[PDB]
Amino acid sequence: YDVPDYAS
Amino acid sequence: DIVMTQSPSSLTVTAGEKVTMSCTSSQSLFNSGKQKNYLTWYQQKPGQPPKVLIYWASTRESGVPDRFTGSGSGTDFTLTISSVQAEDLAVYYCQNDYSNPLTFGGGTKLELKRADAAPTVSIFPPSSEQLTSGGASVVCFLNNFYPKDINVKWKIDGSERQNGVLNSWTDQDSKDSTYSMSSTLTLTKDEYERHNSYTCEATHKTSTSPIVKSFNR
Amino acid sequence: EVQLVESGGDLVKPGGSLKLSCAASGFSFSSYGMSWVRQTPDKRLEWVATISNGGGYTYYPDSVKGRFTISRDNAKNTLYLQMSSLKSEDSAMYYCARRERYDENGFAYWGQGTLVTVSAAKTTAPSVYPLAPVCGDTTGSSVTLGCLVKGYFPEPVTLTWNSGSLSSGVHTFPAVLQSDLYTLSSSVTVTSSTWPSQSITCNVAHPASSTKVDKKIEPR
């Protein structure tokens, strides 16, 4: 579960 | 890009005194989702990679000394040291951490108050050794002034001069809170010797009128 | 201790490529995402590329897209920026900071940069000129002396007075760059009588051209 960056 | 503007490029400061600094955004950094403005403040010392003091506008890092209060929300923002220490004189940045591209704010540098001093200007002719190669740089050192706001104006034979002046300047000095400047005018040997007087004129806060350092061949 | 340790930032000609590595400890690299961040010569720092914790999600600015790629290696447990097609304005120090996943609070963990310098300039040694006054006593009855180092590339030179024995008096103005080559200067100050009686000499080392040189400040 690659998680999108929080600034994405 | 969400554009971060830092002001002022610098801020003088005595010690044990409250200082505030700013940053602003074009857009806003606040999301409703989490409930936070994502503007993170950083601090930097030469040699040292910057570090996180406040994150989400307001919230101080682990270890960050409690003088460091956060604030600012939306688009204008603030960094507030309630009581500055030697150990706090450094460049501070701000950053949109809200959304890519992560932009940081230009810089606000702390440099501390000292009493006024005027420079000890000193002019130097091109070393002969230089001229023996075909070049001729006049070095005018300019030392120990405070504040940093200074002119220097080269002038060949009363006429003003601009092309060929390169200027290095130092930071504030840690022993005495002083800055220094070196202005240097590099001409060729040929232009150098169709000339006679040379001056480095100098204006400063203390300089009632401008300190002049002429030599003359 | 989390540890991010960078390598790869050399002096390559513009149009060339450079690869940079960044090593991670004190956490499971796989759980957090890495970023690369450059600090330019006038010291503004700017985000180069951001990845995620396994990959896929790759993020860059428009300055960077096309040329640079951020990579990952979870067993070698290392972060890489492949930089390619280098413009001179890329010259910056490159830090691998990391993305704070759970918390959201910036880049609280930075490695200690790997300086990328891209120049078509080539290594020319310095010109050390001894700068004595036609004798001016400065403060008290002091005398300012001085040295100017013209025309060296790359960096650094290093400039002492009497081998560092003379530590006082001197200011040394930073390197600055004339014909895409640099210039540095300093003022050693002593109280008159030291000079011209007692030696004062400017020593200058430019390690990339192998030049140590020393210049005696001198009337005749």
Same domain, C77 and C169: no
8 Å CB contact between B40 and B64: no
Determination method here? X-ray
State the architecture of B115-216 in CATH terms.
Sandwich (2.60)
Same domain, C106 and C165: no
Same domain, C53 and C133: no
Domain's final residue, options C89, C105, C120: C120
Q: How many domains does chain C have?
A: 2
8 Å CB contact between C208 and C123: yes
Same domain, C102 and C206: no
Residue B151 CA to residue B137 CA, distance in Å, equals: 19
Q: Does C219 touch chain B if contact means CB atoms closer than 8 Å?
A: no
Residue B86 CA to residue C66 CA, distance in Å, equals: 44
Contacts of B65 (CB under 8 A, 6+ apart): none
Q: Where are the domains of chain B?
A: 1-114, 115-216
Residue B172 CA to residue C66 CA, distance in Å, equals: 41
Query: Among the CATH numbers 2.60.40.10, 2.40.50.90, 3.30.70.580, 1.20.5.440, which is that of B1-114?
Result: 2.60.40.10
Same domain, C127 and C196: yes
User: Residue C142: which domain range?
Assistant: 121-219
The CATH number of whichever domain residue C210 belongs to comes to 2.60.40.10
Positive or negative: CA dihedral B114, B78, B53, B1: negative
Which H, E and C letters describe C176-191, residue by residue? EECCCCEEEEEECEEC
Across the interface, which of C54, C57, C101 has its CB nearest the CB of A8? C57
Q: Does C53 touch chain A if contact means CB atoms closer than 8 Å?
A: yes
Instruction: List chain B residues with CB under 8 Å of C150.
Output: 130, 135, 137, 186
Best residue in C48, C99, C104, C172 for a mutation probing chain B (most B CBs within 10 Å): C104
Q: Does C75 touch chain B if contact means CB atoms closer than 8 Å?
A: no
Report which DSSP code applies to B190.
H
Contacts of B48 (CB under 8 A, 6+ apart): none
Q: Tokens for B120?
A: 């000890």
- The set of chains that have 3 or more CB pairs under 8 A with A is B, C
Same domain, C89 and C48: yes
Q: Which chain B residue has the Cα nearest residue C144? A: B122
Residue B13 CA to residue C80 CA, distance in Å, equals: 41
Using a 10 angstrom Cβ sphere, with 0-12 exposed, 13-18 middle and 19 or more buried, the burial of residue C102 is exposed
Same domain, C129 and C141: yes
Same domain, C105 and C128: no
Residue B122 CA to residue C135 CA, distance in Å, equals: 10
Same domain, C127 and C201: yes
Domain's final residue, options C89, C120, C151: C120
Task: Please give the C-alpha separations between residue B24 and each of B18, B106, B128, C37, C61, in angstroms, as whole numbers.
Answer: 20, 11, 53, 21, 20
Same domain, C116 and C183: no
Contacts of C197 (CB under 8 A, 6+ apart): none
Using a 10 angstrom Cβ sphere, with 0-12 exposed, 13-18 middle and 19 or more buried, the burial of residue B199 is buried
List, as ranges, residues 68-87 from B with C-beta within 8 Å of C: none
Same domain, C134 and C89: no
Across the interface, which of C43, C105, C184 has its CB nearest the CB of B40? C105
**Domain B115-216 in the same topology as domain B1-114:** yes
What residue type is assigned to position B112 of the chain? L
- The set of chains that have 3 or more CB pairs under 8 A with B is A, C
Q: Which chain A residue has the Cα nearest residue C98? A: A5
Q: Which chain A residue has the Cα nearest residue C51? A: A5
Q: How far is the alpha carbon of C56 from chain A, nearest alpha carbon, in Å?
A: 7
Positive or negative: CA dihedral B157, B159, B162, B168: positive
Q: Name which of C75, C27, C32 is nearest C51 in CA terms.
A: C32
Pairing of strands B10-11, B108-110: parallel
Same domain, C164 and C210: yes
Instruction: List chain A residues with CB under 8 Å of C50.
Output: 5, 7
Q: How many CB atoms lie within 10 A of CB C192?
A: 15
Which H helix or E strand runs over C197?
helix C194-197
